[PDB]
Amino acid sequence: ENMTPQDYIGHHLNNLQLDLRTFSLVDPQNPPATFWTINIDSMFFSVVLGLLFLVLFRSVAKKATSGVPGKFQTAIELVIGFVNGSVKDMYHGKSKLIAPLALTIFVWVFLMNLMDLLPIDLLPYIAEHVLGLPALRVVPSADVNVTLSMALGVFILILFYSIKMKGIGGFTKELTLQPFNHWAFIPVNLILEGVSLLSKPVSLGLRLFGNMYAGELIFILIAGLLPWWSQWILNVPWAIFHILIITLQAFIFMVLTIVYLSMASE
Amino acid sequence: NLNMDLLYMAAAVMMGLAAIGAAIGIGILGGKFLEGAARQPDLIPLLRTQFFIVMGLVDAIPMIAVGLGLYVMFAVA
Amino acid sequence: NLNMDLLYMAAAVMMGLAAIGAAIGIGILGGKFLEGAARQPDLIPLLRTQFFIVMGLVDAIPMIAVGLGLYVMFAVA
Amino acid sequence: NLNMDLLYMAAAVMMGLAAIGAAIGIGILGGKFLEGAARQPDLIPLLRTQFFIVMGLVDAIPMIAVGLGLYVMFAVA
Amino acid sequence: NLNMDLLYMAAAVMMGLAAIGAAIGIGILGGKFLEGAARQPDLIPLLRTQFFIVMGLVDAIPMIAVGLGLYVMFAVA
Amino acid sequence: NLNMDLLYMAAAVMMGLAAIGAAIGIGILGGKFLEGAARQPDLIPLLRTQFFIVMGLVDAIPMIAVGLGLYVMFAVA
Amino acid sequence: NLNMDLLYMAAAVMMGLAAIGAAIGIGILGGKFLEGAARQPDLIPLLRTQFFIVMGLVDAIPMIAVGLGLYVMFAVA
Amino acid sequence: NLNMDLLYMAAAVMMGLAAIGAAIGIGILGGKFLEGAARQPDLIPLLRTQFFIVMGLVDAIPMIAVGLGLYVMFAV
Amino acid sequence: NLNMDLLYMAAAVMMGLAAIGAAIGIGILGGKFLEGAARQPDLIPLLRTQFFIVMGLVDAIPMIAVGLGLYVMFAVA
Amino acid sequence: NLNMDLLYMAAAVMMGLAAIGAAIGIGILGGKFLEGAARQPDLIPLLRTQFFIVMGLVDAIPMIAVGLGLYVMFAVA
Amino acid sequence: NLNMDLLYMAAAVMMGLAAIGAAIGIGILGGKFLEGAARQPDLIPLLRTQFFIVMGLVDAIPMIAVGLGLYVMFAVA
Amino acid sequence: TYHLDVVSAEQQMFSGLVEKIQVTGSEGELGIYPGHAPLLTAIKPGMIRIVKQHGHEEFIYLSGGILEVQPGNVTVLADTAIRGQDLDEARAMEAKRKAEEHISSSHGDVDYAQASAELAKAIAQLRVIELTKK
Amino acid sequence: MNLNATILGQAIAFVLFVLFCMKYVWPPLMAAIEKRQKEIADGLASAAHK
Amino acid sequence: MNLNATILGQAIAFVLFVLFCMKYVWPPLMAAIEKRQKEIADGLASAERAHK
């Protein structure tokens, strides 16, 4: 088997894609060029983890009793309390959206990051040999598209809340007049506040992507270059470090969503 | 030869400066977090919730730098 | 056509120096914010207001540096 | 030809060093403003008046570097 | 031949800048840890816990920088 | 020819270093000025008077640098 | 020329930036060790054990650079 | 030709690093001046005298660098 | 052949950077030694012992750098 | 002609780095002198004698650098 | 010919970095000495003794650098 | 110039206008000036130099207390203070004898916490008794 | 990277998961949990001295 | 490069990682759940003690 180190790394860095015009699972050796080459891995893994999240929480919601809580129910009400406590800290308006939005963001991004800890060859190997798919990678949040999808959704909610509460006059006043106040500085202020506004969602998406893609690349590099006896002793410390990374990146995406929507509305 | 060479050189400079920026900024910010934890320890769960907010802003820009670094290496080649 | 290869370098230096400036500026600003929080924790939502007001000015120039470097990397190159 | 390579690099060095200078200067000055605001709230508007006074002078020289970097990029090259 | 021989230089730049960033960031953070550890003994383990936690965030970017430098040496050059 | 390509670079480096120096110098000096007001405001005008007195010597050299940068860029060209 | 001399230059960069980082990080950390040792001179054994815990993390990431620089000089060049 | 633009580059390096030196050293010095002045008002003239005494020493080298920057630039 | 000049340049970089690190690290550490000893005029020998212990670590990497610089200049060149 | 055009850069590096070193070293030391002369102006002459003793140590090496820069620039040309 | 010419640049970098290291390190250490003397004037003859103990360790390496700079400039030239 | 008031629970040590003063502090000694920056602090065992009109000093022992500088008129509060000629060199030498015995006679930490204060009292007296000779 | 239809696919998934959480999950979870808290709060309010 | 050994090495890494997880990650979780059931058990008891 003529596996060079660079080629093993490359195949782990090759997405599985399908062109919607020919509607066929295309080969990674030669990549086609069109917007409609959906990344199969991203879609399937993201939607499956979201469904699992909803199924667990619903499996408690459709049964919950206000008596003595069980050992599983307690775990879900811990995270509910954690999310609601963080929302209650930073948002005081009445909106019913903010709290469930924070909940879904936290748990969904957590599970998506959790994919990164699994062994790099397991699911891709099963996908090629058992099924026959020509490529695979299993971390959804290690792809730009999903992270920008979430960031742009949060962007649209920021615009919705700013418009809704402030009205036509207030939002235009904040975009033009600040931070230099005088009407002589308005032409510069549109650029400064416009770029700040646009920076908020760009920051969200690229923070999450930059963490997760490079982490998966570290696992790929260890597996591809270094000999087995060193692969285990370098794989364990990176996993122990990346548990902290996955938790904090999910938490940061949640917290900054709350902060951005709070500053949009209040 | 030297077209593809210089792309990885550019990624090197980009990610190196980004590494300095993120590392030093969080070093300073977390040092102040620890000083505030040392003076009022039962107040840590609030200051930690402020630290993650500020730390998000600190890393936000080095991380688009890092993203374009790995873009230059793996996407442009 | 050699012209392309220097333009990634010229974008790299802009985004690297912008990352350094905009990371260390917010590090210094936010550390003082956290010590202010450690002294006066009932004031935190006031100092968060002032902190955002000042942080916009810290990120005035560096977000222009990132904007034009990100321009040079894609639009011009 | 040979012109645009170095002219973009010159503009990039100019605005990158400006992006260091403005960010660090406003970081230090704003950090002192925030400890002043935490130490003496209800003097926030007066201290903010003085903060903008000093901020105008702190950023005065860098603004020229930004202007001439934009000139070099979009007029000379 | 120059193409690979310069890639050693690119890796040198990247991982050296990463080394200085990580070292100084951890130095500042640990200095505040020790000062707190001298003031409050039962806070020695508590502050050491938070110290490890945020040291992860300090090293997150330099570790990927160093890994990519090693990748340049052993899988690009 | 090559002359103008290098001369714009020379003016760029000169004015960039001038910008960093002047901006950070006034940042520190005005930081102490703004600190004084947080202690108490009644010598804001007199500390602001000594502030201009010192800020002149701060701006002494960087405007020689800026003057020669402008000369190189517009007169040697 | 180009093969050997650039490898020594890369080694110089690696083991010089490692020197800056590993020296200044430990200077910053050990200064706080000595200040704590002067305030609480009965705690010096406990403080120095904390100091070695932190110092191990400070030095590790420069030690990668130092070892790999020796590798680049003797093993590669 | 190639000679003179490199002369301008060398002058740029000298007269930029002199700017850094003369800026930061007097920022550090004048900040201590302002705190001392904000604490001892009658001594503001006295402290200001000491300030110029030490300012001469701080400016000593950056002016050598600036004089040689102008020499490399214009006189050769 | 010309190659021998770059070896002096490489040792120059390596040893000058080691001088920066070994000077400033000990400067910071000794400053804290003196400051701590000034407030309480006792316990200096046990405290002085600690200064040598930590100073042993500060300069180790610079000592490796200086040794390799001497080796490059006199042995290799 | 070809020979002399690089000795002015050999002079430039020495005097730029020696200017930064001497200026900022004396800045730190003199800032401490003015602080101490603010607490006990009664000791202003005694501290002034200590300042002139220590400043001669501070700028010994930078003057070797400035002297050999002037030698190179005006005796080797 | 470059075997003569580059050696002055190679000594230039050595005696620039040695000067920055020695000047900043002694600036920090001597400033701590001056504040200690300002608050504890009875202890000046003791603090001065400790100052001269520590200062030779600060100068240990920069004088290696400056001695080899002189050697490279005049002996090998 | 300005007015200085020095008191202890046992007596008023001084009260009147003064030209300048040098006073002990918690970290180190400090010199006050007319219209100085207002401050308050605790004071370590030491003394105060009272340089009055026409430049005449007198030396007051301050074994412990607090100093106040908020107004132009300043104020010293002393837990224990002794006038500069009620004490004497023989008394400070007796304090030296006492402290040098107790240093040899203290062996734990709490008793050294007391012997250190006894030593500080002795040393502050041994200081003021020399300053008194000017 | 490669601008791709996956972004809009993930947007559909994101918005529908938020709507499902708003409709099915969140109201009943919070209702049950806070109803337990209410019972304990009245358990405080109930507490023969009076 | 031989590939079978790399998957074997990933298996060893996973085993050692599991032994870390069982002894530093799971017990905090079981502690949190057990202490929240302690808390609500105490709460329901201290609720029913109004009946007395």
Author numbering:
A (entry chain a): 4 to 269
B (entry chain Q), C (entry chain L), D (entry chain J), E (entry chain I), F (entry chain M), G (entry chain P), ...: 3 to 79
H (entry chain R): 3 to 78
L (entry chain H): 3 to 136
M (entry chain X): 1 to 47, 50 to 52
N (entry chain Y): 1 to 52
Paper's wording?
A key component in the generation of cellular energy is the F1Fo ATP synthase, a biological rotary motor that converts proton motive force (pmf) to adenosine tri-phosphate (ATP) in both oxidative phosphorylation and photophosphorylation. The central stalk is comprised of subunits ε and γ and rotates during the enzyme’s catalytic cycle. E. coli and other related bacteria exploit an internal subunit, termed ε, that can sense the environment and inhibit the enzyme under certain conditions.
Masked 3D classification focusing on the central rotor highlighted sub-states in which the εCTD adopted either a condensed down conformation or an extended half-up conformation. The maps generated for each of these sub-states showed the position of the εCTD, with local resolution estimates of 4–5 Å. The sub-states of State 2 showed the best detail for the two εCTD conformations and allowed the c subunits to be assigned to Fo rotational sub-states based on their interaction with the εNTD, assuming that the c-ring remains bound during rotation, which is likely because the interface between the ring and central rotor has a buried surface of ~1200 Å230. When the εCTD is in the down conformation, the central stalk is no longer stabilized by the εCTH1:γ interaction, likely increasing its torsional freedom, and the εNTD rotates relative to the γ subunit. When the εCTD subunit is in the down conformation, εCTH1 can no longer bridge between the εNTD and the γ subunit, thereby enabling the complex to open up to an unclamped conformation and allow a greater degree of flexible coupling between the F1 and Fo motors.
